[PDB]
Design a binder for this molecule. Structure first.
Ligand SMILES: [K+]
Ligand SMILES: [K+]
Lengths: 95, 27
RNA sequence: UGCAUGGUUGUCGCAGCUCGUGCCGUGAGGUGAGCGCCCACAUCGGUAGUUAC
RNA sequence: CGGGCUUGAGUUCAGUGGCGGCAGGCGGAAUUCGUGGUGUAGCGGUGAAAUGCAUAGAUAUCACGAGGAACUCCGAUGCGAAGGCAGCUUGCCAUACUGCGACUGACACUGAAGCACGAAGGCGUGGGUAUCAAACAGGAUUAGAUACCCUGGUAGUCCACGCAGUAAACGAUGAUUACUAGGAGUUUGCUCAAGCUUCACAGCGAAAGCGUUAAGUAAUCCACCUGGGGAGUACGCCGGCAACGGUGAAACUCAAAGGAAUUGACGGGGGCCCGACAGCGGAGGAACAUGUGGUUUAUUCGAUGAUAC
C-alpha cells in the first residue's frame, strides 16, 4: 500500500489496483484535501477488500490527506498493519 | 544612502555598456 | 468684485481642544487646572368647570 | 664612528591546535538514462488554466545495467594576507597560540616602483555531461507583456592546463607601537591570559553613533580628496586571442549637488478597536408635471462631485 502525495495531488497504489484524486473527480484546489484522499482510498479499497489479500503503508510525499487515506483503507476491508514512513536528499541536486 | 546617488551611476553604465555592443561584432 | 468683508448656511463627521512647572536635545523639537444638557410622548395623584363631557 | 645590554625582533625546545593549502583513495541518500515484472485513465502545472508526457501502452511500483553532480543531521564555531575554506580517510607542506631560565644581540616599522595571489561571470585546447539554466521556443495574464507565472531548452554550471585581473573584493573604517572605565555571554589554553560579539565612563562626533577589536590620547610611513554634470568620456600609450583592463583631459554648462536627524502627509507596511458588508419598496422601460444642460430668439440673474439640478 504505497501512497504517493505532493502539494498538488495524492495517488494510492496497492499490489493490483490504484486510485487518485484526479480519477475520483477533484481537479483543482481539492486534490490536496481530506475528502478527495478518502474518496480515492475508498475507490481503491472497494477492489482491495474484494481481492483475497489482507497491509503495510509506504507514504512517500507530504500532503493533506495521507491520514484520511490510511483511515479509509483501514476501515474498508483490511486494516493498516504498519504505517512505515518512506519519505525521501542529503544535499543532492540544485532545485 | 539617499538612493538617488547610485541611480545616476547605474544609468550611465547602461549607456556605456550598450554603446559598445552596437559595434562589437560590427567590423 | 463672495479671491477685499460683516452676519447667516452646507460639508469635513468629528474625541481630544487649551493654560502653567520641571526635565531631555547644539538645534528644528519630545514630554497640576477649564471643557465634553433640554423639549415632547407612558403610567398615577391633587386642584378648574364653559361655547367641552 | 668604536664598543656594550636585553625588554623589541628573530632562532631552538616542549605543549596545544585547526571547514589552512596541495595530492591520492573510499562512501550513502537523492536523482538521470537504458532494459525487463505488476498495472491502467490519467499525469503534470496554476490564483484559474493551457502549452506538454500518456492505450503502436503513461503516472505509480518492483528489479538489473551504465553514469554525472552535490555533501542532510552535527552546524553556531574555527582557520586563512585577502579572495575564501564543511562527507570519511591518508600522505606531503605551511602556519598559529602559550610557555623555557636555551641562543644571537636592535638584526626593527612602513614602503612609491615591481612581483605574487586574487569570488562570480567570460575566453582558448582536450575530456565529460545528471540537475539547474542566460539566449531561444511554446502556453498564460494584460490595452500591449520584447517581463513577472508554467512547460521545454543550448552555452554555461563539472575536470585538467593556460588567459583574463574585476566586485556593495565592505567593518563602505590601511599598517605598526604605547596608554585609558564598567556590565552581559562565548571558545581555547588554566582564578589568569589569549581570541570571539552587543549595552556602555571619560573622550570623540554635525548627528546617527564609536568607545580597550575606538571613530579616545599620542608617534612613524604609505594610499587618497579639494563643488555637481561633461566623465572614468575623448586622444595618446601599455597589456590581452577576444571580452576588456590600466593611465587619464578639455570645451561647454549649473548654483547647487550632498550627510544626519525633526514635524507633517502618504503607503497596493503591519497592529488595536469601533460602524459599511441578511429583508422590504422604488429608480433605470411608458405618458405627463417640474428643474437644469444644449440650440433657437428676448428666452432676466444666480445655484454646477459628494455638499447644483
Ligand atoms: K552604543
Ligand atoms: K576567443
Amino acid at each position: 500500500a504505497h501512497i504517493h502525495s505532493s502539494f498538488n495531488n495524492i495517488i494510492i497504489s496497492l499490489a493490483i489496483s490504484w486510485s487518485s484524486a484526479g480519477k475520483m473527480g477533484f481537479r483543482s484546489s481539492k486534490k490536496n484535501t481530506p475528502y478527495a484522499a478518502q474518496m480515492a482510498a475508498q475507490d481503491c479499497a472497494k477492489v482491495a477488500y474484494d481481492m483475497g489479500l489482507r497491509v503495510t503503508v509506504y507514504v512517500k510525499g507530504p500532503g493533506n490527506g495521507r491520514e484520511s487515506a490510511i483511515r479509509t483503507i483501514h476501515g474498508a476491508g483490511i486494516e493498516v498493519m504498519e504505517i512505515i514512513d518512506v519519505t525521501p536528499p542529503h544535499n543532492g541536486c540544485r532545485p | 544612502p539617499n538612493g538617488k546617488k547610485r541611480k545616476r551611476h547605474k544609468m550611465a553604465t547602461h549607456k556605456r555598456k550598450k554603446r559598445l555592443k552596437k559595434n562589437r561584432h560590427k567590423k
